[PDB]
Coordinates of C-alpha atoms in Angstrom, one line a residue:
Chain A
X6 CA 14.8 24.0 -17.9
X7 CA 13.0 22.6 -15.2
X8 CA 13.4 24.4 -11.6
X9 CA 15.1 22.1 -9.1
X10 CA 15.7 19.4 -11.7
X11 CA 19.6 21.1 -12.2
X12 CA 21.5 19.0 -9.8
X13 CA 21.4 14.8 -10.2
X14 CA 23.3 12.0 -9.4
X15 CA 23.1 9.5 -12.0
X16 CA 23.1 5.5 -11.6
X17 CA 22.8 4.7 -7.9
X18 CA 21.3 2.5 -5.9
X19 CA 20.0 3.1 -3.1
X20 CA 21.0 1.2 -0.2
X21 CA 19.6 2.6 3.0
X22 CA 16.9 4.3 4.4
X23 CA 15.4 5.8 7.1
X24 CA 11.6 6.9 8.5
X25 CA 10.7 8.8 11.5
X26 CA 8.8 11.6 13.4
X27 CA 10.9 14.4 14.8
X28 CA 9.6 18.0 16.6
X29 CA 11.4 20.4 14.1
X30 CA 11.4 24.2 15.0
X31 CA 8.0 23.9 16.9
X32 CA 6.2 21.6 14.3
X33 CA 5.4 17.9 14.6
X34 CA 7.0 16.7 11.2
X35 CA 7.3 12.9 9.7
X36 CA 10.7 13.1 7.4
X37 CA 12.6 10.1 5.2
X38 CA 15.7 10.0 3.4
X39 CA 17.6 7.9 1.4
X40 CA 21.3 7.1 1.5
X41 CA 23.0 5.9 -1.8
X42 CA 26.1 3.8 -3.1
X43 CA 27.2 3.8 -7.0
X44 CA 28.0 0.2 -7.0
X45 CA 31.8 -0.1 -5.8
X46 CA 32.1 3.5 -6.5
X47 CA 33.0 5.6 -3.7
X48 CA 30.1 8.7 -3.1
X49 CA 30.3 11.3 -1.3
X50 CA 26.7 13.2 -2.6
X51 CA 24.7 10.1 -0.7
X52 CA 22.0 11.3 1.2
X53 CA 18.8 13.6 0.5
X54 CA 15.6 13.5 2.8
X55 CA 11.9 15.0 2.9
X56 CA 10.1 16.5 4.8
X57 CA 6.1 16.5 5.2
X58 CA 5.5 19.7 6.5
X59 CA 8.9 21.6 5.4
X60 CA 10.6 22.1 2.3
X61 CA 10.6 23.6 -1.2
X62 CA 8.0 20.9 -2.2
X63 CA 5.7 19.7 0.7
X64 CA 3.7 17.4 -1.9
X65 CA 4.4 13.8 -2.5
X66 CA 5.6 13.2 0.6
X67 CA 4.1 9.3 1.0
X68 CA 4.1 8.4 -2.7
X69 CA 7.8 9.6 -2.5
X70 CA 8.6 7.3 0.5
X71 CA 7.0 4.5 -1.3
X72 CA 8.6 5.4 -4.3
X73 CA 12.2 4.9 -2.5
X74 CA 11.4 2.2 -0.5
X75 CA 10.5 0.4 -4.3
X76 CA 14.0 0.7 -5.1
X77 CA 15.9 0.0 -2.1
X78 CA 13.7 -3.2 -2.5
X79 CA 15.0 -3.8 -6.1
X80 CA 18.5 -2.3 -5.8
X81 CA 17.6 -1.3 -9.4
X82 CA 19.8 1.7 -10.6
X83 CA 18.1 5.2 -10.6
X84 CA 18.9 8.5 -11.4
X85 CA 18.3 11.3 -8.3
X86 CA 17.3 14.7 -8.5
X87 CA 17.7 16.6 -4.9
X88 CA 18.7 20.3 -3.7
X89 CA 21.3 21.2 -1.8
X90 CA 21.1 23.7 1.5
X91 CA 17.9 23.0 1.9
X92 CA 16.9 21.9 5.9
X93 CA 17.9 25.2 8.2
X94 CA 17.6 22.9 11.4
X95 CA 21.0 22.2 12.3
X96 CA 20.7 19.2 14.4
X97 CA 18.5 17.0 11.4
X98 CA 21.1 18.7 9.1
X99 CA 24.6 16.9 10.7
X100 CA 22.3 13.7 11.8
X101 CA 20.9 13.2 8.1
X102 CA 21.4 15.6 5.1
X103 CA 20.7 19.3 4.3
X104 CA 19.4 18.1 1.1
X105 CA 16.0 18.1 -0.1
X106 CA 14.6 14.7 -2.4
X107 CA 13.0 16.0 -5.5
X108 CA 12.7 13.0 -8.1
X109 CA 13.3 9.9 -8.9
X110 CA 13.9 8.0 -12.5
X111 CA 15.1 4.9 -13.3
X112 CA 18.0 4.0 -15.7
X113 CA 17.6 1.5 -18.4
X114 CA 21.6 1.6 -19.3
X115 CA 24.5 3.2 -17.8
X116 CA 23.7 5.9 -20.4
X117 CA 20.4 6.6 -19.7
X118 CA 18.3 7.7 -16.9
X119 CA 14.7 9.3 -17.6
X120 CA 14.7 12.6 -17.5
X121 CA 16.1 16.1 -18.1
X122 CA 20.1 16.7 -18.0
X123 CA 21.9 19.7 -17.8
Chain I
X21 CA -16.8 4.9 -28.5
X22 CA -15.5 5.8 -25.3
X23 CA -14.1 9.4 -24.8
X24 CA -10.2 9.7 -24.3
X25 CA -9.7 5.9 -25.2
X26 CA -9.1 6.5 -29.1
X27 CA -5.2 6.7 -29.1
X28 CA -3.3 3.8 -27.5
X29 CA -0.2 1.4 -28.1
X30 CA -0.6 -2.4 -27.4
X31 CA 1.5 -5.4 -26.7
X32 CA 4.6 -3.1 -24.9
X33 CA 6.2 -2.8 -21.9
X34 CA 6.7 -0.7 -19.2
X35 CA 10.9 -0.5 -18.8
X36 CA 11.2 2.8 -17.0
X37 CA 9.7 5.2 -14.6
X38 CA 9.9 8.6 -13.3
X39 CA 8.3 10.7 -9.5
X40 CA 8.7 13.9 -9.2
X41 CA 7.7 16.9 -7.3
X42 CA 7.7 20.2 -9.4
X43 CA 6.6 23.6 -9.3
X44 CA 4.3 24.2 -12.8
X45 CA 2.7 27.6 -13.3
X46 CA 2.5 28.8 -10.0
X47 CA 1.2 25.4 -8.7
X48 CA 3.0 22.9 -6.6
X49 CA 2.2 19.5 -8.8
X50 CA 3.4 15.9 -8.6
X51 CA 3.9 13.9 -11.4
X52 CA 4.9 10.1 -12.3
X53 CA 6.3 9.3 -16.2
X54 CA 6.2 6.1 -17.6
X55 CA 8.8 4.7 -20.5
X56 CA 8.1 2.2 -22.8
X57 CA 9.6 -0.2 -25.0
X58 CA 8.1 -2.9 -27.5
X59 CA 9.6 -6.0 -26.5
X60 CA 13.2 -5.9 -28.3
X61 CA 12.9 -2.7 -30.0
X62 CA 12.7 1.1 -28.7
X63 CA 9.5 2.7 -29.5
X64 CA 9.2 6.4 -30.7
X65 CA 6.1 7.0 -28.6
X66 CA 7.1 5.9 -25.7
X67 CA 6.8 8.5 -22.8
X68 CA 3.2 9.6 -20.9
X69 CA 3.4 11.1 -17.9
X70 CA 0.6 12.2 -15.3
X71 CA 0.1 15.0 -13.0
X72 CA -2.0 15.1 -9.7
X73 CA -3.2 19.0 -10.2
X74 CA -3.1 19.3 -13.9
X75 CA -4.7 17.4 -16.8
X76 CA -7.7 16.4 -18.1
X77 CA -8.3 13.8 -15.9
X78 CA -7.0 14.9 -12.1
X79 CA -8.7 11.9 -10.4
X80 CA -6.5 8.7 -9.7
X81 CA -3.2 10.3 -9.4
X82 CA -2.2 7.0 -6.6
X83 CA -3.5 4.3 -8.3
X84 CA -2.7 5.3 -11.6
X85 CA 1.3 5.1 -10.0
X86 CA 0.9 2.1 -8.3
X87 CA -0.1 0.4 -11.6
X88 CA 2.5 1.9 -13.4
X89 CA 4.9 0.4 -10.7
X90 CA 2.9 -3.0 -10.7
X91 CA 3.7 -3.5 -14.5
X92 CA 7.5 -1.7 -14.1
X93 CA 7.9 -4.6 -11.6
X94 CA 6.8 -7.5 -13.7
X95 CA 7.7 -6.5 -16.8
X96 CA 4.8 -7.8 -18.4
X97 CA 2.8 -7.2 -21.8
X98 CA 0.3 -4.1 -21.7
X99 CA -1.6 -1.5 -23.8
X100 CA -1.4 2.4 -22.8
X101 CA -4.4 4.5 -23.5
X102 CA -3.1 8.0 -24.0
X103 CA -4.3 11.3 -25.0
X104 CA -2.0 13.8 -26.9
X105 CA -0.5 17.3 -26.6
X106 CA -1.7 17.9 -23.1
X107 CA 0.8 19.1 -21.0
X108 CA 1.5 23.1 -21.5
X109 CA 4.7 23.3 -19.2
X110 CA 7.5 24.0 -22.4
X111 CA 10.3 22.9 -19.7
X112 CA 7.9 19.5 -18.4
X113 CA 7.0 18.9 -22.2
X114 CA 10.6 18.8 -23.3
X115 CA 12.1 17.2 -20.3
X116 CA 9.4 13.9 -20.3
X117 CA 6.6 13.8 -22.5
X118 CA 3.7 16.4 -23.9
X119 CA 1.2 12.9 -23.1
X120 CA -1.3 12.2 -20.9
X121 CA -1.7 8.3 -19.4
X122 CA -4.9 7.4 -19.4
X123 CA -5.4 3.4 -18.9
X124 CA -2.9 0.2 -18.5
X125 CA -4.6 -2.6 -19.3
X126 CA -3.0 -5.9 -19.8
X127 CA -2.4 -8.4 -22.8
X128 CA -2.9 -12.5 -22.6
X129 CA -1.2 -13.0 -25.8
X130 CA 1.0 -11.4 -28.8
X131 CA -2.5 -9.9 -30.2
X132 CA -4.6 -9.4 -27.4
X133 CA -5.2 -7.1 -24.5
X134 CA -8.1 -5.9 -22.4
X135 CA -9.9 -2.8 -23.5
X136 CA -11.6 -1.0 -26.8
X137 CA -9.7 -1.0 -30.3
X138 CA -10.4 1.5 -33.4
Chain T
X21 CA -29.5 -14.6 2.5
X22 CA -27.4 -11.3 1.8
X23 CA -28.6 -8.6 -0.7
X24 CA -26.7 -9.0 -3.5
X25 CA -24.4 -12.2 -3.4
X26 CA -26.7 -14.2 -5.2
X27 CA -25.1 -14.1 -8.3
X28 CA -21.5 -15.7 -8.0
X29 CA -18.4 -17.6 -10.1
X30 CA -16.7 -20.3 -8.3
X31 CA -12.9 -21.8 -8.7
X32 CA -12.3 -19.1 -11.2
X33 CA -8.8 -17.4 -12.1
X34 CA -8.3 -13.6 -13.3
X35 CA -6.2 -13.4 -15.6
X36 CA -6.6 -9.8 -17.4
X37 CA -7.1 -6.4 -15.5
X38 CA -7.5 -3.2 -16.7
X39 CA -7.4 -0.4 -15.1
X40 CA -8.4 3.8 -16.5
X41 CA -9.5 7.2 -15.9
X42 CA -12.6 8.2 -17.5
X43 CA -15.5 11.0 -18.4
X44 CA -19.1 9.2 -18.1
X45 CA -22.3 10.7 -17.9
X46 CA -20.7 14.1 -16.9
X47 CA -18.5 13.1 -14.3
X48 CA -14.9 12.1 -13.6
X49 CA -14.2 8.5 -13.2
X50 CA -12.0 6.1 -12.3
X51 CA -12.2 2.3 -12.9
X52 CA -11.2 -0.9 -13.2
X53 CA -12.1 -4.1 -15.0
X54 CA -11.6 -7.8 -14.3
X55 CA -11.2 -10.8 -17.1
X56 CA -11.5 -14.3 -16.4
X57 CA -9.8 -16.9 -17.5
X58 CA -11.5 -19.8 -19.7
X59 CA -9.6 -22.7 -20.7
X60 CA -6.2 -22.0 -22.6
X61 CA -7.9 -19.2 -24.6
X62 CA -6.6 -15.9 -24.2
X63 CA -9.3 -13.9 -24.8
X64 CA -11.1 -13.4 -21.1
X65 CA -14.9 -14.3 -20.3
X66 CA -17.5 -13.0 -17.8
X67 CA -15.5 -9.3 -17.3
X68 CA -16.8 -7.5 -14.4
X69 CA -16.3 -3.9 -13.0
X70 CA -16.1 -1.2 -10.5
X71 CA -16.3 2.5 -10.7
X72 CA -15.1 4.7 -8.1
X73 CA -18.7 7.2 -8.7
X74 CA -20.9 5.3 -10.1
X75 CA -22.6 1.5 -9.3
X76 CA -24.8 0.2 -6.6
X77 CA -22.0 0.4 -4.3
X78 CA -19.7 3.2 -4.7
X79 CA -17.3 2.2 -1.5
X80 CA -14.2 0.1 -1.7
X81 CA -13.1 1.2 -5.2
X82 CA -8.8 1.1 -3.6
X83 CA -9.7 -1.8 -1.6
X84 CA -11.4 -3.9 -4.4
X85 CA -8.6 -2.9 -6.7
X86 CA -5.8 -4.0 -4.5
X87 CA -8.0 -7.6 -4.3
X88 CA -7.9 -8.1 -7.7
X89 CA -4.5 -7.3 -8.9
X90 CA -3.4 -9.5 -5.6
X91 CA -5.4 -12.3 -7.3
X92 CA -4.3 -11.8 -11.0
X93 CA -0.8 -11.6 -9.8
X94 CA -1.1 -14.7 -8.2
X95 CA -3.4 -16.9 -10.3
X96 CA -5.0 -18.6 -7.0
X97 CA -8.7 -19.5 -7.5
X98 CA -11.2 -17.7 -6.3
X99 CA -15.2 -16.7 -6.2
X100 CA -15.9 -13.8 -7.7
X101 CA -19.9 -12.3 -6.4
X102 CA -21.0 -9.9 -9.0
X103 CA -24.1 -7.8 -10.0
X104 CA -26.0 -8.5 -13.8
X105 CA -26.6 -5.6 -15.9
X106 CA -25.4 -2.8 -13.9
X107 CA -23.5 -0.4 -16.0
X108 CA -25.5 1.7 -18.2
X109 CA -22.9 3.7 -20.5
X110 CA -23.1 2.2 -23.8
X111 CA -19.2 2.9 -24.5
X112 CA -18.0 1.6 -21.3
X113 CA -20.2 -1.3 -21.6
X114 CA -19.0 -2.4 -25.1
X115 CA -15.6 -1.6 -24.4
X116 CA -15.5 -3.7 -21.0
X117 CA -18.9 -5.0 -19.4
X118 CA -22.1 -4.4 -17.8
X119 CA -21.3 -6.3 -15.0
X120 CA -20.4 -4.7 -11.5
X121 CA -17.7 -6.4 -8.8
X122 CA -19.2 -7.1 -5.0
X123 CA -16.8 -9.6 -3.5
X124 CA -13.8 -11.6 -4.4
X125 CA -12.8 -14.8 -1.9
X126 CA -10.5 -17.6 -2.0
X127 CA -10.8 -21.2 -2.7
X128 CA -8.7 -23.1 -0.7
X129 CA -10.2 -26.8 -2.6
X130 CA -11.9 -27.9 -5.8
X131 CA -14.5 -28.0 -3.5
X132 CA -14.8 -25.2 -1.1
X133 CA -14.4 -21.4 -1.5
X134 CA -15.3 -19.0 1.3
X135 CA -18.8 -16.8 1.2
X136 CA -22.4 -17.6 0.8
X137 CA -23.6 -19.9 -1.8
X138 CA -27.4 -20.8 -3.7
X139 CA -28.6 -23.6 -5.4
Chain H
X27 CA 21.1 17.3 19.0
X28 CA 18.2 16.2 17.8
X29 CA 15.3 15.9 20.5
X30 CA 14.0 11.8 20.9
X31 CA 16.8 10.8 18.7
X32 CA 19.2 10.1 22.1
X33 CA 17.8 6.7 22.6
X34 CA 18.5 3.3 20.2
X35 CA 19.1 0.0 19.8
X36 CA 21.6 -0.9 16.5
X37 CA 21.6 -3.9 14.7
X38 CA 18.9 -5.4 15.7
X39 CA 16.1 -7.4 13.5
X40 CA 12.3 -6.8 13.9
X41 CA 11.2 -10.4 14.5
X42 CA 7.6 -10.3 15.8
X43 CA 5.0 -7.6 14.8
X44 CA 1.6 -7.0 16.5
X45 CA -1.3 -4.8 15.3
X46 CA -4.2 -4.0 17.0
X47 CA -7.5 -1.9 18.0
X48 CA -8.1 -1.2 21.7
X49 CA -10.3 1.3 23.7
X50 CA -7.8 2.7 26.0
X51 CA -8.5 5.5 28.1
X52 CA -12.1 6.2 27.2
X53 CA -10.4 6.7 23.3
X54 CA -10.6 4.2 20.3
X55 CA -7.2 3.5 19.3
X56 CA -5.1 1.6 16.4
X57 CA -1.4 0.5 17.7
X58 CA 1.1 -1.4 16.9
X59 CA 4.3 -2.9 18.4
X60 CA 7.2 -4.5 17.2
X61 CA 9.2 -7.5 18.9
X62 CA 13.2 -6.9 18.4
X63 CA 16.5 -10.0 18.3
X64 CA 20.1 -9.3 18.0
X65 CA 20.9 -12.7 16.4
X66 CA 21.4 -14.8 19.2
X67 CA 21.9 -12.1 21.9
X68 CA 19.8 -11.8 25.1
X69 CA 18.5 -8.5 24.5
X70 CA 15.8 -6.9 27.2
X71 CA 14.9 -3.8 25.2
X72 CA 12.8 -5.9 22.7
X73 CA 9.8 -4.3 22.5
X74 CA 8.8 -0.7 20.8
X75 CA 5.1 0.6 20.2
X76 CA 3.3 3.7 18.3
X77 CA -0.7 4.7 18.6
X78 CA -2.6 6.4 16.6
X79 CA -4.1 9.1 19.0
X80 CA -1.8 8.9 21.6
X81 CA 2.1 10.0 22.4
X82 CA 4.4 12.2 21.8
X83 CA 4.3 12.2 18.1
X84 CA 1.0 11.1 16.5
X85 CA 1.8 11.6 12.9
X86 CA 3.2 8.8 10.9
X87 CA 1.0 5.7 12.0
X88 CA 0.8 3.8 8.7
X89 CA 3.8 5.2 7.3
X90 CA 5.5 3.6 10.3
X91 CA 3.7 0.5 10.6
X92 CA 4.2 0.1 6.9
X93 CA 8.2 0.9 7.4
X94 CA 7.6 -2.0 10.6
X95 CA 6.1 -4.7 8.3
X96 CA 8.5 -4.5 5.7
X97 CA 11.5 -5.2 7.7
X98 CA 9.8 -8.2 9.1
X99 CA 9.3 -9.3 5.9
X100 CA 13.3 -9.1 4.8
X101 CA 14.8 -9.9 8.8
X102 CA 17.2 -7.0 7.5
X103 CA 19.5 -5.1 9.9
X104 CA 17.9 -1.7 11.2
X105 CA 18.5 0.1 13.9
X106 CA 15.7 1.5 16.3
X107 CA 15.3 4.9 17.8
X108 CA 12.8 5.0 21.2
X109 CA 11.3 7.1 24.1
X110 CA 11.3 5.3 27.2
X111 CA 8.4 6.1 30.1
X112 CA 5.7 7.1 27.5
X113 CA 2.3 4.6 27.6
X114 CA 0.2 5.7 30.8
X115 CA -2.2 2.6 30.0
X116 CA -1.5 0.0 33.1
X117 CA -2.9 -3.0 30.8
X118 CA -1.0 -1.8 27.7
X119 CA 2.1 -1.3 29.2
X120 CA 2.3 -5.1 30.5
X121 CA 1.4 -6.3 27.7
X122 CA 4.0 -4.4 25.2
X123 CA 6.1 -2.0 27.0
X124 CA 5.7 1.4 28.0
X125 CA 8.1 2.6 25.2
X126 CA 7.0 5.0 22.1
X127 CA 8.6 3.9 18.7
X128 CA 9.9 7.1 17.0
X129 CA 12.5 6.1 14.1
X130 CA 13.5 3.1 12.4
X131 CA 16.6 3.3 9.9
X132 CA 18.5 0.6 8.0
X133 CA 22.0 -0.7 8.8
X134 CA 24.0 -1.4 6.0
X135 CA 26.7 -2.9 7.6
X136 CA 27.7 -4.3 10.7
X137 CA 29.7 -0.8 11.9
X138 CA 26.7 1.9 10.3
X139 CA 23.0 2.7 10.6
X140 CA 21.7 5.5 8.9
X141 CA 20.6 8.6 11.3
X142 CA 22.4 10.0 14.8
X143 CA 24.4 8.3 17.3
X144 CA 25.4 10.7 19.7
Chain E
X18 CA -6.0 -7.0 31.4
X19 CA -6.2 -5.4 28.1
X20 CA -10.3 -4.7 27.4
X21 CA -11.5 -7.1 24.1
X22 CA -7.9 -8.7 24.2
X23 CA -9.0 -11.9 26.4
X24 CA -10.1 -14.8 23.8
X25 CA -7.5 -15.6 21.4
X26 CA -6.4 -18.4 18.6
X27 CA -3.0 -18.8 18.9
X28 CA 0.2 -20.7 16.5
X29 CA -2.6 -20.5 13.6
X30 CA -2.2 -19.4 9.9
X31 CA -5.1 -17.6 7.7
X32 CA -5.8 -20.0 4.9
X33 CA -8.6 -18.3 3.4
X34 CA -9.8 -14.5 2.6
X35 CA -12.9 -12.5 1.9
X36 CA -13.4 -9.3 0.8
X37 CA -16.7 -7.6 -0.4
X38 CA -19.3 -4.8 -0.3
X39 CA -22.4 -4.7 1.4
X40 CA -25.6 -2.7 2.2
X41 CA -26.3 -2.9 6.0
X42 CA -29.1 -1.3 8.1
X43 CA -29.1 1.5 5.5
X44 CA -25.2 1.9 5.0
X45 CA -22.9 1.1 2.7
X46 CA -20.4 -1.1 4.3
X47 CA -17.0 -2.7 3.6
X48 CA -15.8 -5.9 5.2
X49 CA -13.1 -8.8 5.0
X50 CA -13.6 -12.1 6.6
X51 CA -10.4 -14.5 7.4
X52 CA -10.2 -18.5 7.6
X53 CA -7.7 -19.8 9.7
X54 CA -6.2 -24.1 9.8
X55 CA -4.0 -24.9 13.2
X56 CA -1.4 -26.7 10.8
X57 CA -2.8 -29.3 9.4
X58 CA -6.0 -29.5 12.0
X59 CA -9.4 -27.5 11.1
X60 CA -10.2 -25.8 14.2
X61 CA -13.6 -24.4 16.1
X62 CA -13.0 -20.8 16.0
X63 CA -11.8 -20.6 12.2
X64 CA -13.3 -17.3 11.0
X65 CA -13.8 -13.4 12.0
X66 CA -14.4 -10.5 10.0
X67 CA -13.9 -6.6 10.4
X68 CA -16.4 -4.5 8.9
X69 CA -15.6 -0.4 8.2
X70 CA -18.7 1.3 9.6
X71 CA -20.2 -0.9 11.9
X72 CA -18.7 -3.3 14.9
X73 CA -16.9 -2.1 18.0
X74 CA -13.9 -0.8 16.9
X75 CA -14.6 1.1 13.8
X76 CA -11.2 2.3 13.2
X77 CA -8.1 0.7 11.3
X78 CA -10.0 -1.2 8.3
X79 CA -7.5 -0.6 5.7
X80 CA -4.8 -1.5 8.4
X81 CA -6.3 -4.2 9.3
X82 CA -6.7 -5.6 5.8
X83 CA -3.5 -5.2 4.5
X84 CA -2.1 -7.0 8.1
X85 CA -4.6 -9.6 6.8
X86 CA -3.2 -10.0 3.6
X87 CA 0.0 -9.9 4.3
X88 CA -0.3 -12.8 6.5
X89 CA -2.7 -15.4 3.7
X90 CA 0.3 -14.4 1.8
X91 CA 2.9 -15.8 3.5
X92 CA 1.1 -18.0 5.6
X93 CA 2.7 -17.5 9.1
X94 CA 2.1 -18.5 12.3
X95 CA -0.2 -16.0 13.6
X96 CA -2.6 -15.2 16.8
X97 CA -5.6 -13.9 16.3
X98 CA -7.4 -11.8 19.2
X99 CA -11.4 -11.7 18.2
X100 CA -14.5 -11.2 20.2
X101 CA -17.7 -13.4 20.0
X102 CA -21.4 -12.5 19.3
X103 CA -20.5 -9.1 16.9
X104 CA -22.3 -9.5 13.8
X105 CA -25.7 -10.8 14.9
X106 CA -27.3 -10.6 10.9
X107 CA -27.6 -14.3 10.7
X108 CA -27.2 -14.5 7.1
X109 CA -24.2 -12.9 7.3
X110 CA -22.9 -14.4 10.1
X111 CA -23.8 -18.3 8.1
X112 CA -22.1 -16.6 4.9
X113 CA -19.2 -15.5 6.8
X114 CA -19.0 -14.9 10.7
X115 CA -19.9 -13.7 14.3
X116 CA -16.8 -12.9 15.4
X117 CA -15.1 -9.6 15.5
X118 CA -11.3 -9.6 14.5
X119 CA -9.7 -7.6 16.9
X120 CA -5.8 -8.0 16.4
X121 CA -3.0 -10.3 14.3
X122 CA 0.3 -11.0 15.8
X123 CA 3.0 -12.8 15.1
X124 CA 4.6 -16.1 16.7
X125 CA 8.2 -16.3 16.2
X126 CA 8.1 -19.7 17.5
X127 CA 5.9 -22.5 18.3
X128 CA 6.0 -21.7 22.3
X129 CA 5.9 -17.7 21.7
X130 CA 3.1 -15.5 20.1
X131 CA 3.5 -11.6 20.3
X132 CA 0.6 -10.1 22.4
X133 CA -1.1 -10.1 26.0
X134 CA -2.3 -13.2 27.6
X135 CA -5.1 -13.9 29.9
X136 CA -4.2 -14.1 33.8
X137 CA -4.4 -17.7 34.1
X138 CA -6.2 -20.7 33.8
X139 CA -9.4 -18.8 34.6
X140 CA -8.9 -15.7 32.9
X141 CA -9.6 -13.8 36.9

C-alpha cells in the first residue's frame, strides 16, 4: 500500500481555514491547515496542517494550499488523507493540529472517494 | 504525427480529482489524478495521473493542475491525451492509475474537440 | 509602430483551448493553443499558439495562458495580435497551427478594442 | 504559546485592500495592506500590512496577499492575527499603519475562529 | 509623503485590459496596460501600464497583474496611484501608454478610497 495514505477521513467538507507565518524551533516557516465538518455530523478528526519547511513531505506546499482553498470555495465533499503525531512544537500543536495534510480527493458519491482504502 | 498524442479519449468529462504528496522510490514527488466520466455513463479508462519528478514529461506539473481544476470546476466537455503504462510505483499504479496525462483540450460540440485525431 | 503587432484580429471570441506537454525538436515542451470562434460553427478558425521554449518570444508562457483561459471562460471580445508562420514542427503545426500568440486585449465596443492598430 | 500569535482582532471582514510598489528605505519593495469592519462597529484597529523585504517574517507574500484578496472577494468572517510597532518607514506608517500582518484564519461562526486565542 | 504615491485617479473602475509580449531595447519584455471610465464619464488620465523588466519599479508584475484582473473582473471602484512620463517609446506609448501603474486600491465607498493622500491642495 501506499506510505502515509493509511489513515483518511472520508466525505467532508471543509469549512475553515487558516494561513500564516510563524518562527518554529529557530526557522522562519509559512504553515496552513484545514479544519473540517461532515455535514451535521459531529467530527472530532477535523484539523490537519502543513508546513513549508517541516514535515514528512515538505513538497507541495502552495499547490496544496490552493488545492484546499478550492474546496472550502466549493464546499464540495472530499476524502482526506493526513498523519497523526506529526508537529513536535507544542505550542502550533494545541493552537492548530499535530497532524500533517497529505492528500486530497474528491468524492463523486457517498461511496466513493478517489483513491486507495485500507 | 505528433509524439505522445496518439492515445486519447474525447467528448468526457472531468468528475473527480486527486493532490497528493508521496514518497516514490526514494524521491519525494507530488502528484495530481484526474477521474473521468463520459457524460451519463462510467468510463473504464478513466484515471491519469501526473507526477512533478517522475514521467516522461516532468515539465508543467502547475499548469497541467490548474487545468485539470479549471475543467473539474466547469464540468465541461474535453479530450485527454494520455500515454500508457508509465508509472512503475506497484502501490501508485494500483491505488490511482498506471497513466500519464498529457493534454486537455476542449470540445465545441458532441463530435469535436481541439487537437490531432488517428 | 511596435515590432510585431502588425498583424491583429479584432472583436473576436475564443472559444476552444488546448492545452499539452510535448517533445519537439529535442526538447521538452509545454504549450497551449487558442481557437476562435466563427459564426455558429463549432469547428474553430485562425488557431494561434505559445510554447514555453520555443517562438520569437519565449516569455510570458503562465501569463499568456492565464489570459486566454480568462477570456474563453468568459466569452468577452477581444483583439487577439499574432505572428504568421512561426512554428516550424510539421506535427505540431498540422495538429494545431503555425501561428504564434503576442497579445490579447479587450473590446469594450463594436468599435473600439484597446492596442495599436494599421490600416 | 505561540510567539506573534498574542495579538488579534475576531470577526472582523477585510473590506478594502491595497497593493502596491514603493522604494522605501533605499530598497524596492511590494506591499500590501488590508482595511478591516466589524459590521457596523467603530473599530480603530482597521488596518494590517505585509512587505516583501521587510519585517519580521518575510516569507509568505503572495500566499498572503492571495489569502487577503479572496476574503475580500466573499466579505466572509475571519479573524486577524497582528504585530503592533513594526513599519520604521515615517511616510508608510501614516499612510497604512505601523502594524505587520502575520495570520489570517476563517470564523465559522459567530463564537469560533480557527487558530489560538490565548 | 510616500515617494511615487502623489498623483492618483480615484472612485474609478478598469474597463479595459492589455496584455502582450514585446522586444524592447534588446529585451524581451512582458507588459499589461489598464483603461479605466469614472462611471459613466471617460476621463483624462485613462490608461497606465507595468512592464516586467523595465520601468521604475521592476518588481511585483505577476502581482500586479492578477490585482489588475481581478479588478476588470468585477469592476470596482478603484484608485489608481501612477506616475507620468515612464514609457517614453512613442509608439508604445500612442499604442498603449506613458504612464507607470504604481498601486490599485480599493474604495469601499464613494467618499473613501484605501491609500495615502497628498498634503493638501498643493501637494507641499
Amino acid at each position: 500500500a501506499m506510505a502515509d495514505y493509511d489513515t483518511y477521513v472520508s466525505n467532508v467538507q471543509i469549512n475553515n481555514l487558516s494561513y500564516g507565518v510563524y518562527t518554529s524551533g529557530g526557522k522562519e516557516t509559512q504553515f496552513f491547515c484545514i479544519g473540517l465538518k461532515h455535514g451535521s455530523e459531529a467530527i472530532s478528526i477535523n484539523a490537519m496542517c502543513k508546513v513549508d519547511v517541516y514535515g514528512n513531505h515538505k513538497q507541495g506546499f502552495d499547490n496544496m494550499l490552493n488545492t484546499a482553498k478550492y474546496y472550502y470555495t466549493t464546499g464540495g465533499d472530499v476524502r482526506i488523507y493526513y498523519k497523526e503525531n506529526v508537529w513536535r512544537d507544542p505550542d502550533f500543536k494545541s493552537a492548530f493540529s499535530s497532524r500533517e495534510l497529505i492528500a486530497i480527493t474528491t468524492c463523486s458519491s457517498s461511496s466513493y472517494c478517489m483513491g486507495p482504502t485500507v
